[PDB]
Amino acid sequence: GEIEFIESSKDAGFPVINTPSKTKLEPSVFHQVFEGNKEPAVLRSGDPRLKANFEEAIFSKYIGNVNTHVDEYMLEAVDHYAGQLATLDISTEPMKLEDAVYGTEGLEALDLTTSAGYPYVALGIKKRDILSKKTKDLTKLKECMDKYGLNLPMVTYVKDELRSIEKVAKGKSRLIEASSLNDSVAMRQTFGNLYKTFHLNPGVVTGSAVGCDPDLFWSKIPVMLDGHLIAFDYSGYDASLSPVWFACLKMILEKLGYTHKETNYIDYLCNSHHLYRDKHYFVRGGMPSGCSGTSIFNSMINNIIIRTLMLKVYKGIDLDQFRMIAYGDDVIASYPWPIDASLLVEAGKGYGLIMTPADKGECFNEVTWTNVTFLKRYFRADEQYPFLVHPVMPMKDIHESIRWTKDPKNTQDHVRSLCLLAWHNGEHEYEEFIRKIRSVPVGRCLTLPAFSTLRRKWLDSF
Numbered sequence: 001g002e003i004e005f006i007e008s009s010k011d012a013g014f015p016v017i018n019t020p021s022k023t024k025l026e027p028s029v030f031h032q033v034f035e036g037n038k039e040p041a042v043l044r045s046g047d048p049r050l051k052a053n054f055e056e057a058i059f060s061k062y063i064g065n066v067n068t069h070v071d072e073y074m075l076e077a078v079d080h081y082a083g084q085l086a087t088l089d090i091s092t093e094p095m096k097l098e099d100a101v102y103g104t105e106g107l108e109a110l111d112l113t114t115s116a117g118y119p120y121v122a123l124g125i126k127k128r129d130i131l132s133k134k135t136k137d138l139t140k141l142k143e144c145m146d147k148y149g150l151n152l153p154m155v156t157y158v159k160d161e162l163r164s165i166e167k168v169a170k171g172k173s174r175l176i177e178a179s180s181l182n183d184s185v186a187m188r189q190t191f192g193n194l195y196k197t198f199h200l201n202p203g204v205v206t207g208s209a210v211g212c213d214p215d216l217f218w219s220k221i222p223v224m225l226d227g228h229l230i231a232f233d234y235s236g237y238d239a240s241l242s243p244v245w246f247a248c249l250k251m252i253l254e255k256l257g258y259t260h261k262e263t264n265y266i267d268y269l270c271n272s273h274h275l276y277r278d279k280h281y282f283v284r285g286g287m288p289s290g291c292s293g294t295s296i297f298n299s300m301i302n303n304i305i306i307r308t309l310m311l312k313v314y315k316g317i318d319l320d321q322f323r324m325i326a327y328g329d330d331v332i333a334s335y336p337w338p339i340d341a342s343l344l345v346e347a348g349k350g351y352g353l354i355m356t357p358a359d360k361g362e363c364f365n366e367v368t369w370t371n372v373t374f375l376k377r378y379f380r381a382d383e384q385y386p387f388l389v390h391p392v393m394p395m396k397d398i399h400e401s402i403r404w405t406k407d408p409k410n411t412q413d414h415v416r417s418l419c420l421l422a423w424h425n426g427e428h429e430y431e432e433f434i435r436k437i438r439s440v441p442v443g444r445c446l447t448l449p450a451f452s453t454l455r456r457k458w459l460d461s462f
Contacts, residue, residue, distance in 0.1 A: 001286020038162040057171030061239035066352035077307035095192030106196030115178035152180035156276040176290035187292035214391035235354040237329030246270040
């Protein structure tokens with residue numbers, strides 16, 4: 001992706017978007033009890049922790065586009081992946097408005113907490129002023145969609161989250177896009193059944209883990225991923241995507257039965273208009289992370305990409321023996337024979353993609369079930385029930401999270417959530433975690449689950 005054009009918003013009649021000033025992240029009561037290195041991402045240009053130009057840093061992910069047509073390797077990758085998805089019998093019928101807005105199995109209700117986008121943010125109109133969970137009213141929404149239409153600008157926000165020391169100093173904060181409520185709803189009507197099918201079928205047919213529950217899904221992954229593991233990282237996947245990959249996505253959607261008109265929303269994702277504070281800008285390429293379906297569409301594109309690279313380097317590859325699962329840019333895969341990931345990385349560079357060894361590794365090392373990660377979690381089979389596999393979030397990451405809070409009124413829920421991750425590191429680690437939590441008076445006011453209770457519920461969940 002590439003920023004084609006940027007200018008002062010006032011020159012085009014757009015008001016300034018007043019984004020948050022300071023981080024909502026503050027040190028929690030546990031900040032001193034546990035060790036950690038991460039701090040809130042830089043949100044403003046004057047941040048004294050910066051050692052780089054902030055506005056340059058946050059837009060540097062738009063590294064450019066490779067201008068290529070869909071080639072023979074892509075065409076075969078699209079065909080192969082489309083063959084898998086056809087098994088699911090995805091409906092291309094529009095999802096009914098009430099289901100797409102207020103919830104249905106496989107598609108959670110539209111988040112009423114996030115930005116309504118343009119023009120609502122300039123008019124002080126929040127999502128809750130239009131929608132209501134308890135009434136399921138669609139009257140005001142139909143009014144607003146008629147009044148303002150579709151293909152509205154996106155609003156760029158800086159993501160308020162913990163980041164490493166290096167990423168704070170380099171100013172490399174992440175950006176999230178808010179689609180207009182109008183466009184979010186229309187995309188959920190157009191693709192809602194696709195979204196539902198993906199959420200309800202994580203695994204190697206969708207090639208997707210979006211919406212998975214790691215507590216359950218993790219025992220399935222080694223059954224599905226039979227051979228020699230393949231895994232690698234991307235640097236700035238979303239913004240690196242060139243238009244040719246969106247053309248591939250449109251081809252695959254059309255093979256599933258979507259009309260050319262129904263795939264027009266992919267053009268809305270690919271060629272996008274953005275408001276950022278006092279600036280407005282146009283982007284060609286790049287997935288605009290945060291719009292409707294971007295995790296699923298990133299995952300589908302990744303399924304096309306990896307097959308393309310395998311076909312290009314390993315002529316004679318048999319994709320019917322290839323397996324992969326993606327969560328956006330994150331991939332875990334297998335093939336019955338060894339594959340040199342460094343070769344795929346070079347083929348990826350030719351397509352405008354930046355691929356690196358897995359988990360900041362120095363080289364494209366041997367990937368094993370001991371050292372592979374997915375969704376930042378390791379894989380550890382249970383000592384007693386070897387067919388059940390723990391998702392293991394590192395205690396370092398749990399420690400980083402517990403030291404900060406965006407709202408101390410939610411301490412109980414925050415710490416409980418962290419307990420559900422921590423116990424998979426084993427009983428000795430969990431008891432130490434609980435002991436340190438309880439060394440703060442708040443910690444003894446919390447209802448914390450017992451290790452044996454967590455283990456019992458986990459075993460029983462299967």
